[PDB]
């Protein structure tokens, strides 16, 4: 099967969330940038060329937390108690239909992991687009569902909440704006480029009951130690 990148899925997905397409395309590349620049798409890094680019892991991590949280809702019955991000909206449900939602909700993890590991080794540039596109099509799959009637309102809310948290988690790694520095609870506030408050003992080489060679129970004057010479 020949895979081809589809830009139409990102445009459709971005329109639903009322956000710029550049925000979706910049998953994992938001570090060290202003979100206003990310929103406008200015300063976007070039496509990856190395299989060890942390962007590939960053996008893949965002994909698997969508899948991890989706399956938690899918298997809500098996839990002793559901986690926070899925319990407040399924609370009004009954047990027999809470034991359901694993038959009426389709699986969306069909062939992601196998293909991503192949694309990462073969061509890293296509792997980044594949992981982003997979996140959008999975969101559209969970947003374009229509039957049965009792599940549409419980999954579309989930789809928007998950994709928003993924974007927000990526957003919280960008360049911060302006804020009160004293809300942390202390006077001083250092940065990652500061050396004033570094540990003094850390400048030395890091790292390190009876002494067998110490004359501690031998009462001999320190000025007459030549009596211990081997001779």
């Amino acid at each position: 099967e020949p895979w081809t990148f589809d830009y139409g899925k990102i445009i459709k997905t971005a329109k639903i969330l009322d956000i710029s397409p550049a925000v979706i395309e910049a998953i994992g590349a938001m570090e060290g940038r202003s979100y206003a620049d990310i929103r406008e798409g200015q300063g976007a890094p070039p496509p990856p060329t190395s299989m060890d680019d942390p962007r590939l892991m960053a996008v893949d991590s965002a994909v698997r937390i969508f899948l991890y949280n989706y399956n938690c809702l899918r298997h809500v019955s098996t839990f002793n108690k559901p986690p926070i991000h899925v319990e407040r909206l399924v609370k009004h449900l009954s047990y027999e239909e809470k034991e359901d939602l694993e038959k009426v909700l389709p699986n969306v993890v069909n062939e992601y992991h196998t293909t991503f590991k192949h694309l990462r080794v073969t061509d890293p540039a296509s792997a980044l687009l594949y992981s982003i596109e997979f996140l959008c099509i999975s969101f559209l799959t969970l947003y374009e569902i229509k039957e049965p009637s009792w599940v549409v309102n419980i999954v579309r809310e989930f789809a928007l909440t998950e994709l928003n948290t993924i974007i927000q988690s990526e957003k919280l790694l960008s360049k911060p704006g302006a804020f009160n520095f004293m809300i942390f609870g202390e006077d001083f506030v250092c940065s990652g480029e500061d050396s004033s408050m570094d540990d003094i003992s850390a400048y030395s080489s890091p790292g390190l009951l009876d002494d067998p060679f110490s004359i501690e129970d031998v009462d001999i004057s320190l000025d007459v130690l030549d009596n211990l010479a081997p001779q």
Binding site: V218, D219, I220, S221, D223
Partner: protein, 62 residues
Amino acid sequence: RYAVASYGPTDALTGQPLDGKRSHGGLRLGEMEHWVLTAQGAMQTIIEKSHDDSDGCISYIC
């Protein structure tokens, strides 16, 4: 070489001579030498050296 005196500089706290030739004090009859003198039975020698010559005094107890 060293040989000092019947008297000389004295430690303020213990009342014993100072340490070694450098301070013009006495020489040490350490832990192992009281073991030997006790083994030999030399008890009047211990009185002469550890009391008369080092810090011996009179304590009054009710």
